[PDB]
Amino acid sequence: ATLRELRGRIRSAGSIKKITKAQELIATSRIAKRGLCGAYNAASRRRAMKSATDNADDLIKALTLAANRERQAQITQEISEIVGGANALA
Amino acid sequence: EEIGTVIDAGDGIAHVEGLPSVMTQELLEFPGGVLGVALNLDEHSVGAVILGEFEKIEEGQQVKRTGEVLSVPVGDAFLGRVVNPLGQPIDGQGDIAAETRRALELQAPSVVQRQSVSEPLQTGIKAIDAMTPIGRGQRQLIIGDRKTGKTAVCVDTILNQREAWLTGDPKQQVRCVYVAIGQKGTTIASVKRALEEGGAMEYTTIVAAPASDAAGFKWLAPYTGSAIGQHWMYNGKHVLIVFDDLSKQADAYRAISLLLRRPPGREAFPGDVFYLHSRLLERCAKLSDELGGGSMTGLPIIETKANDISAFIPTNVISITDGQCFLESDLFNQGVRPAINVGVSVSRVGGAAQIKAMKEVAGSLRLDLSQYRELEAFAAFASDLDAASKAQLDRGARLVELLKQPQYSPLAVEEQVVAIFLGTQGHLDSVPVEDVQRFESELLEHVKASHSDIFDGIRETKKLSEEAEEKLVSVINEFKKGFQAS
Amino acid sequence: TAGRVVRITGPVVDVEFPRGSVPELFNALHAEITFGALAKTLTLEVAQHLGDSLVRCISMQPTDGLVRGVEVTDTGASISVPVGDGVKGHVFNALGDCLDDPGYGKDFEHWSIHRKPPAFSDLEPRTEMLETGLKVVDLLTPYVRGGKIALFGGAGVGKTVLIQEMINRIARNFGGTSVFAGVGERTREGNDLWVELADANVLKDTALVFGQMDEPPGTRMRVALSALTMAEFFRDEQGQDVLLFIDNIFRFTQAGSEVSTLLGRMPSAVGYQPTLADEMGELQERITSTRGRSITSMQAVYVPADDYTDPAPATTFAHLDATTELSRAVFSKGIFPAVDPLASSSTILDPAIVGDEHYRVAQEVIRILQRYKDLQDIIAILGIDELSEEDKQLVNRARRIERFLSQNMMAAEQFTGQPGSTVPLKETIEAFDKLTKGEFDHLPEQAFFLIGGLDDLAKKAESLGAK
Amino acid sequence: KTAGRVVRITGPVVDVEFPRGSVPELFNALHAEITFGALAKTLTLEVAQHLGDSLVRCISMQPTDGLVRGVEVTDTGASISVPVGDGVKGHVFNALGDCLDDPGYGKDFEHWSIHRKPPAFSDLEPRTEMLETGLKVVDLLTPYVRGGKIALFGGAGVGKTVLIQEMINRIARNFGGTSVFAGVGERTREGNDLWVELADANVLKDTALVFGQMDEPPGTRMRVALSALTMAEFFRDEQGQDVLLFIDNIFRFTQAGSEVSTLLGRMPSAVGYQPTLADEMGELQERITSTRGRSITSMQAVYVPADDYTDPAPATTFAHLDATTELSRAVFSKGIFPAVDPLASSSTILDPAIVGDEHYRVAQEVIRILQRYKDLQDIIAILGIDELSEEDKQLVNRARRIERFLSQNMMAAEQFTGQPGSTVPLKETIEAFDKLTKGEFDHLPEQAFFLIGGLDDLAKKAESLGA
């Protein structure tokens, strides 16, 4: 279930990235003319959503690397089981 | 007089030549009192699993066939004793006066030898007794990562049978078999000390296969405990057997099979590992009235790794048992103790395993809590929640607090009914969440002191009458008048 | 001319026969276990001809106590079970023995449990809806009379409860014969079903065949064939409509995988036997209606580890006309039946068979639920308020729809304490048409949870202060 | 006759044929000679299997390079045995009992077989007595047990050996009894460093060091732990000494067992490990224990391959322990030393009946805050803390301060930083973390909590930072 969970997380992160990039562009437009504004309460929305888009990109990259490690490892483990059975039947 | 010869040996496995009339699963005597079991019978030789002290086995040694399959002594003398998978005492308290012997591989009761699970087996734990009720003859899997409180749940359940034992009535008494497979010796000693302190060794037997034991003993220990419990079950008694834990037995069986060079499967497990556990756990049954009405309730324990319930052995056992309590370390660390994941935990017997009053006050508790967890996740970042959602969230928070419970703190069934009544009938809605627990305890104490008739009615009749319910509502409101909410 | 046991390894037995007396494949042989505690007569099924007059066989009972060199007798035929109207009202094991009245059916006609499937030219596709009264089933996974229906799911998601629900709604008023095959499932469940059928007075029309999970792999392999042989007799000889329930068919495959390497077969992917699809094909293709002879079959299919990509359920999917796929995710939310509306399917859900209105409403429900699934991660992180107005409206509608697909079932009262309900198909279609238009958007979502039709919805809403 | 001959050599595994009636018993030590110049030596073989036909399979304690088929093998008649007594203290030994710092030393001592049974179950008594260390994280969350079993898990380079050195400093220095250190499959230069450090601290005279390190055949790396445990068991059972047993690293014992199992022709288990993984660990660990009236405090480093805590070796090790400190790569990356995972680590005596209600309450509050902080990492990674509720932001700041304050300037860390370590009394630790969980230091900057001791250190560091 590890690979399935990782793929679900990759899909979630991709959707979040798309939404945050759209919001960053909308904030760019609104600058020329809610609480997603970074440390504003504690322009700012544009920077916060650019940061969030970059963070989601990094998350997608890391999750994809983990997913590929898991995919390779599953192939290797499956082959190990198959060949172990074959050897024991040799 | 057939005498075989050890033609090879190693790692707790021997290969013996001769013995043409040996049976499959027969018990074999190797010199120096060593015991083995014949598993692989082929024309060339017999593959045998040594049941301890295999370092004494040697090529050329004479092997005698005992003419009997694996069997263990059984009888009431085993109560209060620690034994090994052969029924031999290991507590140093002398011999055990066996009533008779029982073969480990006797078939489970047939479909027509049973009756539906109908009697509660109270664990004393509100979460389990209200949302995943266990009946007599049920198999409830306790599954979770390490240190999630699985042994705590099982030992509390054993301890909660002390009052039933004191009743003296076989229809009420539950005799407990605790099977320790692959555990460190001091851990078994600590479980035994906890049982002794609570007065449970009066009605508990421990079958111990510590981690030092041969893989054969760890493989056999659940079956030995099952045979001991079955002797009582077929004699009209009610039995509770805990397997702590079946993962270690599966590992021991895998070791044995790989050493016998049987072909491996998933995670190198033998093909018949599911069959091992299913044959073990279907001997827990609720017998028909014609067979005496006895029962054996199974509490297998499964340890997962990284909360991965999709591993091979957890999947097998989940598919075998009548429900499971999933324990999670995230819930544990959050203060949800017992750390039962309500959404995925379930009892496949349901209200039949509860008294009428409990079924009345807890009929929809598990579904309500599942929906509450869903809503809490969904509304985590919502800023403007409607009235209905806010009410559901507040009710769910109070219910979660209500189900929290410390270790070694059993609640009698009537007290559990009153507590769940406080919860699900809306009497906690005016209490701050952080006070719910205290409120509950105080309220119960109050009812215990000046209104014990409510408890007595629930206990005698297994029901909450309309008059008793009205009285309880009145008492709750009067108590709330004076309760001090920090 | 008898054989003798040469090798014993768990449930697989090698038997040597005199040259010229090797039993045919799938023949039943008899061997004696004489040890008093375990004394019995093993039935062995011939699996392979190993050569040199040796046969590899699969024991039907546990081999504990069996001794090398003991006599093996060839019955000359395959495992055969009693057939006829007499099997109705009685409980049998995979070998045809009657459990509730031992010795019963000894004198009946007996049929071999190994049989070829119907000829292709005799096959007629079935397109006729079997209304259940369950909202989610009737709307999104409409069942087919005389067709093949499966309930897929991981462990403990409600396959058995839904099987019992379908026995309640379909078998109770059935005008034909019912066959229930318990394949490698819990003995307690079999006793419960037996008692429940006797209580409902449906037992007199039902033949029960049980091979439980505690039996050796051979019994779990052959019990489905035994039940199916009884059903085939009712289909082809008596010529009446037959209901066939199997719980759980995956066990068949699993049992076959448990003896594969002991039979000397190199394992396939994911530890399954190499013959997975072929053995499943034999069995499943026997489970079918033929022209003029109807078998409505309903199979519970266990999905190992909830992994729908697992080879067993993946291979099973091709054999079904309708699939109700149960989901752990839905279960954990408290939604019962835990049906995954997006993953489930039915071959008769198209405008031509079910009509334009039903098809349109079902497609709209699926579209809304798919969009809600797509939006769930965003709602989890950024919150609902960052959705567009239309997406917020769709999310509210989808939450109400997903809750309204849940239903209080007759078989679930043992768990909820609430009595069940039945919803007519026309009412279901109208209710979900109204829901997809937002006609109920003003009611609290908790009003839609575990109810029947629109009257139940109104009553629960008023109970919740809405209307 | 009575003398065998080498028939097969497959790396460090030797098959030896003996005359009929002279086959050595399992675990007997045999001797063969390699005469080729540079590699000339006496091989000690250990009988591991009886292969049949008067053949035995043995594990060589030394590399077999230069061994020739047919050379004579002599059976000592007994298993490997090591010197025991007070004299082993202050000296370094290899797995065979040879003294390295003084060759020939200890040949006249009493010699004990390295193989023996664990204590009888009736002699086992659970240990619940806190072994205060002065380390905040250990004392609060994973209190060590005197006479109990402690393990330090961790991946490569996360601080297992530095923490073992820390515990030697904190516990062994003031120890009134005997100490045994077992270097198992670890760096030889680390063994040299430990020898020299103990000499400098004057702890060596109380300490027996046994080393079978990385550049050894797998047989020696499998048996060195047993040899050190044999010395520890002598001290426990013959002198009534309180014994400290340090093992670095026990995973290396499991790994050597896996190598040997592969060499012995056994069928592999999952992840290629030996089928007897749990059995071997059980034998060794069950020997490592206290008994009624006789104390062994054991501390074991446990390597975690590829940072995979699910790996079978650490997974089977977990069950044998009373306290478990799990070092985390993620914690290490933050610069937090000791790099403990406060949520994954555990102690059997961290319960109110043993450590008292206040210690337990404070520990549970710390764990709850850290768990809540971990649950929020999904959001924080993307959006940061600015989107959380006020309660969650308060909790996140509290959790960051708590996680930093679990760090400590360790005694053994001076060598890496030049900063002397600190010792925090358990009472001050409880008070400080109570105040932290209550929000009494929410105004101080985060770095003030990093790598310090008690509350005076926090005050001084915060003042230095301006707060």
Ligand SMILES: Nc1ncnc2c1ncn2[C@@H]1O[C@H](COP(=O)(O)OP(=O)(O)OP(=O)(O)O)[C@@H](O)[C@H]1O
């Ligand atoms: N209801 C509870 N409330 C508080 N602490 C609890 C509760 N149940 C168990 N614990 C504690 O949690 C820890 C784990 O308990 P336990 O040993 O039963 O778990 P486990 O899952 O069986 O562990 P292991 O993997 O060591 O076998 C122990 O400290 C126990 O005291």
Ligand SMILES: Nc1ncnc2c1ncn2[C@@H]1O[C@H](COP(=O)(O)OP(=O)(O)OP(=O)(O)O)[C@@H](O)[C@H]1O
């Ligand atoms: N408390 C500490 N303070 C500062 N640096 C430390 C500390 N602990 C460890 N380190 C650094 O980390 C390095 C690795 O530590 P250590 O040798 O204890 O790790 P390990 O887990 O035993 O490693 P391995 O798996 O390589 O044996 C140390 O050499 C030192 O550089």
Ligand SMILES: Nc1ncnc2c1ncn2[C@@H]1O[C@H](COP(=O)(O)OP(=O)(O)O)[C@@H](O)[C@H]1O
């Ligand atoms: N419709 C339902 N309503 C309420 N609870 C249910 C429903 N269906 C299943 N459950 C719960 O989930 C459990 C699993 O049901 P079951 O059908 O036995 O699982 P499986 O899918 O493995 O056959 C039941 O025992 C019951 O407690």
Ligand SMILES: [Mg+2]
């Ligand atoms: Mg435990």
Ligand SMILES: [Mg+2]
């Ligand atoms: Mg089921």
Ligand SMILES: [Mg+2]
């Ligand atoms: Mg190190």
